[PDB]
Structure formats: structure tokens, C-alpha cells
């Protein structure tokens, strides 16, 4: 209700101020709890928002509380439509009610033993850190921080997802990428319970062949300075086999590469026929219309590939590839080349 | 190696969780270790760093790094390929844990009479944990360069 302790002495001022930081973070949450252009738009947290919305119904939280009274992991039937795993991580109630406040009340806020207050601030720490992150991201954080979900919690949550062991093993071996494709949605603090929805990715398509296409502008190299013609393949990006088709990711930085695994999000992808691969082998093939751009913008540039470098060298530009121990080894003539 | 604190008290629970957070960061990071414009050429920002990382992974290469920074905190090391790199030992938590903390702990079966020791440890341990957290949320590559990375 209120810490009715008087704030003067050095011992009281630290624990009382520590209590106020807890009560303010709690109060804060109640206030808060109220190519490429051809792609299709999604709602990244439509799944998570849907679950949070269910908790706001009257008396719905009570079902959650009663199930997590005996264990720290339970499957709850919500009144609307979805069964969700629920997890009580920190129990601040029984600490404040049965270990701290009795110690505090007995000696009139003179905490004679400094050990109790230090334990409290650490027990209180995760809440403030979670509160602090939610306070800076409008209730939706990404990537999923270690205060949101520790590795111990994440690997255990990984094990309970409805996927094969091959999919489970992938996520546990690359937990860092999982964090970056996840969201945390803060939504309700009522009836002595705080709960937020964690939204983890599900990788349903694994181990299919995937390749990266790099392209660079191709211009003629004629003697006339201003009279030149240029051409560029626009189908750059990642292409993975998927369901007899190819999942195409035009945006370069939408995927994260670890060794041979490409972690991508299908939401920012187009689904293309398998004949797309013919544009690499036969750009004039009559079965798929290869995408290209045209220009007279005769500018030199270079494209770094996975295992080398593409060099589009035009005009009077000096283009050179060098070795660290030997210096320049090859001088590029005008045109597009590769080393 | 192992936390065998059998006696339970509010102080023991404090150092043990503080010890566990350190023991977790090491393992956590160890897991991580295994208009216009359209004409602009594409680059590899960390190809230089990736190349340096790859050499440190070479057999017997870390020993070269370790032994050069054993006596001083600044050294130029010649890697097996041919490259000399500036090396910097910023935190020495090893010599802290072995000769000041671990002896204090063992004496009374984890009952620390001076709460200052846990506060010093958590302060000594803070810089490591904060560096880990940035790497833990940014896939091992941070930018801009934080003050915890390099003061």
C-alpha cells in the first residue's frame, strides 16, 4: 500500500529507496499495460498480441495463477481459444511477504544485518531490468534479452516445442540467432501477477539446399566517353529450396549466416518457381523471365562474394586486387570480372 | 570446477549465485564461440576481423598470445601466418579468483564474514558480465564499440 517507514537514517534510506524502485517499476507497468519492394507485409507479433489479448478478459488471469501454484511449468486452458505454456520464474511475493517485510517490520526499518538488503536488490534486479527494457521499447522488445529469458529457460523451452529432435538440436546449438528472431510482449500486471508473452521462432523447413546469388552492373567498354550501355541482374539475394518451390529473400541483411546454415524469415520472402535457377545457367531461357535492369549510368564498383570478389571496372578507373604479402597481383581491364 | 557449498545461509546463497553467474557467462560465451545508392558496391565489413579470428583458432596459436601478455599488458604478437597484432590484457580475473577470493571462500565453508568480499567480487565480476550481455544480444558482433568493450 505504502512503505510507511520514515526516510532519514543511512540504513533505512537504502532499503526504503530500494523498495520504492520496486514499487515504481510495478506502477510503471500498469501505466504501460493499456529488389525487395515486391514483398508482402506481415504483422510480426499478431500471434503474440492474440495471446496477450486473452489475458485481459475478466477473471482469465485467475486460471493462470491457480495452475502455477503447484509447479513452475503448466499448460493452461484460456477461456478464449489457445493453450499456452506458462512459467513462473521469479517469486517476489513470498520473499516480500514472508522473508523481507517481517525482518524489516520487527526492527522498525533498522535493518541491522546488511546481508538481507543485498539479497533483495539482486532478487529485485531482474524485475527492474525487464521493466527497464520494456520501458524503452513500447512493450515489445527484440532481440530477446537474457533478462527476458535466460539460456537455462530458453533451452528448456526449446525442448517443449512441437518439432523434431533435429529441429530442437538446431535451435539449442544456435540460441543466439533464436534470440534475434524472437519478441517479448509485455501486456498485463493485475491480481498480484505479472505476465508477458515470449514469441519464439519455429523452423519448419530445415536442410534444404540454399544458395546466394551476387550480381554487379555490366556495361560495354567502348572508346566513346559518354556513349555506353549498362545492364544489371536484379534477382540478387538468397534462394532456398522449399516445398518444390524456391523461397526468395531479396533483402541481403534479413538472413544471418552461421557456417553453412542460413537463418531467414519466410515473412519477408516471395515464393518462386524452381525454374529461377535457370537464370544463372541460361539467362535467355524460354521458361523463366530473368529479371534485369538497364541504365546508362557507367559507374565502376565491386561486389564481394562469399568466396571472392566481383569487380565491375569501367571508364578510367584504376581497379586492382592485391595480396597482403605480395601487393598487387592482377590489374583489371574494363568490364566485369572476378577473382 | 564445482560449487560444493553444503551449508545454506543468506550469505552463502549470495556468493553462490554470484559465482554461478560468472560460471554461466564463461559457458554462455563458450557456446557462442563454436535517392541513388543502388549502384554502391557491396562489402564485407568484418572480413578483416574474421581473418584475424581464424588465425587465433590455429593449433598452438593462443599459447603464443597468452605467453606474450603474461608479464605485461601490451604486446605485439607474430601469428603463424605473418601478421603482427597489438594485444591487450584488460582484466586479469584469474589472479583475482585464485589468490584473493577462492582462499577466502574455502576457509569457513562459504560463510563470508565481511560482506565487502561479495560486493568487491560482484564489482570485479561486473565488467565481464556486461561484455557478455552485449555479445549475448548482438550475435558476437557489436557496433558501435561500447565502453565496456574498450574504455
Amino acid at each position: 500500500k505504502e512503505t510507511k517507514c520514515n526516510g532519514t537514517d543511512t540504513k533505512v534510506k537504502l532499503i526504503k529507496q530500494e523498495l520504492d524502485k520496486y514499487k515504481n517499476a510495478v506502477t510503471e507497468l500498469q501505466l504501460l499495460t493499456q529488389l525487395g519492394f515486391l514483398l508482402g507485409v506481415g504483422s510480426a507479433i499478431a500471434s503474440g498480441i492474440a495471446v496477450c489479448k486473452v489475458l485481459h478478459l475478466e477473471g482469465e488471469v485467475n486460471k493462470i495463477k491457480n495452475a502455477l501454484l503447484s509447479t513452475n511449468k503448466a499448460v493452461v486452458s484460456l477461456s478464449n481459444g489457445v493453450s499456452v505454456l506458462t512459467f513462473k520464474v521469479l517469486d517476489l511475493k513470498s520473499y516480500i511477504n514472508n522473508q523481507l517485510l517481517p525482518i524489516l517490520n520487527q526492527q522498525s526499518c533498522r535493518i541491522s544485518n546488511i546481508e538481507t538488503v543485498i539479497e533483495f536488490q539482486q532478487k529485485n534486479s531482474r524485475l527492474l531490468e525487464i521493466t527497464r527494457e520494456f520501458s524503452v521499447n513500447a512493450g515489445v522488445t527484440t532481440p530477446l534479452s537474457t533478462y527476458m529469458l535466460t539460456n537455462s529457460e530458453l533451452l528448456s523451452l526449446i525442448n517443449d516445442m512441437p518439432i523434431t529432435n533435429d529441429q530442437k538440436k538446431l535451435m539449442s546449438s544456435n540460441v543466439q540467432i533464436v534470440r534475434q528472431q524472437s519478441y517479448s510482449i509485455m501486456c498485463i500486471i493485475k491480481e498480484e501477477v505479472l505476465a508477458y508473452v515470449v514469441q519464439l521462432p519455429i523452423y519448419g523447413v530445415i536442410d534444404t539446399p540454399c544458395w546466394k546469388l551476387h550480381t554487379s552492373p555490366l556495361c560495354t567498354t567502348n572508346i566513346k566517353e559518354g556513349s555506353n550501355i549498362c545492364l544489371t541482374r536484379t534477382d540478387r539475394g538468397w534462394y532456398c529450396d522449399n516445398a518444390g518451390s524456391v523461397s526468395f529473400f531479396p533483402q541481403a541483411d534479413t538472413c544471418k549466416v552461421q557456417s553453412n546454415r542460413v537463418f531467414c524469415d519466410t515473412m519477408n520472402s516471395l515464393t518462386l518457381p524452381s525454374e529461377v535457377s535457370l537464370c544463372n545457367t541460361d539467362i535467355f531461357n524460354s521458361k523463366y523471365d530473368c529479371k534485369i535492369m538497364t541504365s546508362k549510368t557507367d559507374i565502376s564498383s565491386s561486389v564481394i562474394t562469399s568466396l571472392g570478389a566481383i569487380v565491375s571496372c569501367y571508364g578510367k578507373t584504376k581497379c586492382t586486387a592485391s595480396n597482403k604479402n605480395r601487393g598487387i597481383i592482377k590489374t583489371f581491364s574494363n568490364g566485369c570480372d572476378y577473382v | 570446477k564445482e560449487t560444493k557449498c553444503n551449508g545454506t545461509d543468506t550469505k552463502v546463497k549470495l556468493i553462490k549465485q554470484e559465482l554461478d553467474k560468472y560460471k554461466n557467462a564463461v559457458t554462455e560465451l563458450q557456446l557462442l564461440t563454436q535517392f541513388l545508392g543502388f549502384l554502391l558496391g557491396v562489402g564485407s565489413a568484418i572480413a578483416s576481423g574474421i581473418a584475424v579470428c581464424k588465425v587465433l583458432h590455429l593449433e598452438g596459436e593462443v599459447n603464443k598470445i597468452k605467453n606474450a601478455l603474461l608479464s605485461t599488458n601490451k604486446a605485439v604478437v607474430s601469428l603463424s601466418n605473418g601478421v603482427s597484432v597489438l594485444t591487450f590484457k584488460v582484466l586479469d580475473l584469474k589472479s583475482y579468483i585464485n589468490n584473493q577470493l577462492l582462499p577466502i571462500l574455502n576457509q569457513q565453508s562459504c560463510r563470508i564474514s565481511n560482506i565487502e568480499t561479495v560486493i568487491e567480487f560482484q564489482q570485479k565480476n561486473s565488467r565481464l558480465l556486461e561484455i557478455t550481455r552485449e555479445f549475448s544480444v548482438n550475435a558476437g558482433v557489436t557496433t558501435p564499440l561500447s565502453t565496456y568493450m574498450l574504455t
Epitope: 517507514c5 516480500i96 511477504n97 525482518i103 524489516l104 517490520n105 | -
Partner: antibody
Framework: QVQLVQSGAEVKKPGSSVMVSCQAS????????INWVRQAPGQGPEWMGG????????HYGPKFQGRVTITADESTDTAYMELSSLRSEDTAMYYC???????????????????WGQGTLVTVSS | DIQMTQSPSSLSAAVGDRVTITCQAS??????LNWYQQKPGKAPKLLIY???NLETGVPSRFSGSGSGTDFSLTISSLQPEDVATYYC?????????FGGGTKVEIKR
């Protein structure tokens, strides 16, 4: 430094009801959890119940609920305990014990007894 | 209800002796356990709260330990004025319950 003064010992007839008072000096009743503990001869103490006026909550032990009423008169800083339908098993020394309730959240419960009354020996006999 | 088992029921020790008293709970009560001293005919006096915290004004020879379901009370140098009955008490859930009590006597 706060002394709890209970009503005097007395003999009550079987089947009747008894009222015991408990007077606080030096502080307000709202500032405490006021508990009632009894001790039969040759037994340990048994907690009967407690009231938390700052929260306006009364709690009764399961054995005693429905025949015990504990009230807190904030106008006089006196707590009371009324036990009805007295019988032989009730012959015991009844203690009034407090726990400080300065900074309390909701659903706060009694935990300990640091300040005690002198005790009231209620003897049920003919 | 939670039953508290205090052991032993009685003990005899000389002045200056080290004496240990144990309290066990019927279920896990964390460290929500108190200790009281009752001299014959007097009201009980609070000695230890939350299993291990010393009450102000209580002689330094008293100490408490334990967690979970088993707790202990230890007097480092038993003195003549310690002759009394001691009770442990839990508050994990209601009703608050006590141990059977341990009566401490001095051998002289």
C-alpha cells in the same frame, strides 16, 4: 517498550462465553498484527487467530473459526478475544501477542510474536 | 496443518556446554521458522526469527541455522539462566504451528 495488558484471570461456567481484553500502551493497534495464542497445561502454544487493522482483515485458526471473535477497538487501542461454548478442554493460559505491522502490503499474514501480553488464565469449572 | 517435530524432548548439560536443538517441519517451509524461550510461568520471548536472525538484546550465545524442512538452535556456552522450554514455530501457511517443545536443564 510497548506493554500488552490483558484482562484478568477468571472462572467461567461450562457452555457460557468469555471475553478477554488486551490493552496496548505506547502505540496504536493499527500499527501491529495482534495475535491470540493459548497454552494448555503440559502442551505447547496454539495460535488461535490474528487481526490486522491496518488492512482490516481477521484470521481464525481452523479449529476455532465459528466460535471465536477477535476485534480491534482503535478508539481505545484494546484488542479482544471472545470464545463461546466453553468446556473443559479450554482450561489454559491465553496470551495476547503482537507483530509490528508498520510497512505492510496486502495479503500480509502473521509470522511471529515479538511482544506478548502477560497471559490470562481462564478456568472453566462449576 | 504443518506439524513441527522438535528433538530432543529433554536434555541435561553442564554450564559452559555446547547444546544443539533441532526442529523439523512436515513440509518445506523455506526458512520461515521462529524460536521462542519460555521460562516456567512466564510468557514466551522471541529469540530467533526467520531461522537465523538474532533478536535484539538476545545473548550472542544463541544462534539458528537450517533451511527447507530441518532447522537447528545452538547455544555456544550454556548458562544457568537458560533453563527453560524452547519452541520452534512455522509461518509458511496457516495455521501457525509449534513444535512439541524442548526442556533444557542444567547438570551441576
Amino acid at each position: 517498550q510497548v506493554q500488552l495488558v490483558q484482562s484478568g484471570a477468571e472462572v467461567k461456567k461450562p457452555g457460557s462465553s468469555v471475553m478477554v481484553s488486551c490493552q496496548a500502551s505506547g502505540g496504536l493497534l493499527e500499527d501491529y498484527i495482534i495475535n491470540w495464542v493459548r497454552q494448555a497445561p503440559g502442551q505447547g502454544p496454539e495460535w488461535m487467530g490474528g487481526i490486522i487493522p491496518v488492512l482490516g482483515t481477521v484470521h481464525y485458526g481452523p479449529k476455532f473459526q465459528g466460535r471465536v471473535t477477535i476485534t480491534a477497538d482503535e478508539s481505545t487501542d484494546t484488542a479482544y478475544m471472545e470464545l463461546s461454548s466453553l468446556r473443559s478442554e479450554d482450561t489454559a493460559m491465553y496470551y495476547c501477542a503482537t507483530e509490528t505491522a508498520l510497512v505492510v502490503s496486502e495479503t500480509y499474514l502473521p509470522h511471529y510474536f515479538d511482544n506478548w501480553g502477560q497471559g490470562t488464565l481462564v478456568t472453566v469449572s462449576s | 496443518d504443518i506439524q513441527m517435530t522438535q528433538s530432543p524432548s529433554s536434555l541435561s548439560a553442564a554450564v559452559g556446554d555446547r547444546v544443539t536443538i533441532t526442529c523439523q517441519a512436515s513440509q518445506d517451509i523455506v526458512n520461515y521458522l521462529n524460536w521462542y524461550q519460555q521460562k516456567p510461568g512466564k510468557a514466551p520471548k522471541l529469540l530467533i526469527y526467520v531461522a537465523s536472525n538474532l533478536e535484539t538484546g538476545v545473548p550472542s550465545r544463541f544462534s539458528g541455522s537450517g533451511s527447507g524442512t530441518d532447522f537447528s538452535l545452538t547455544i555456544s556456552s550454556l548458562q544457568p539462566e537458560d533453563v527453560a522450554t524452547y519452541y520452534c514455530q512455522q509461518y509458511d501457511n496457516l495455521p501457525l504451528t509449534f513444535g512439541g517443545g524442548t526442556k533444557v536443564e542444567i547438570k551441576r
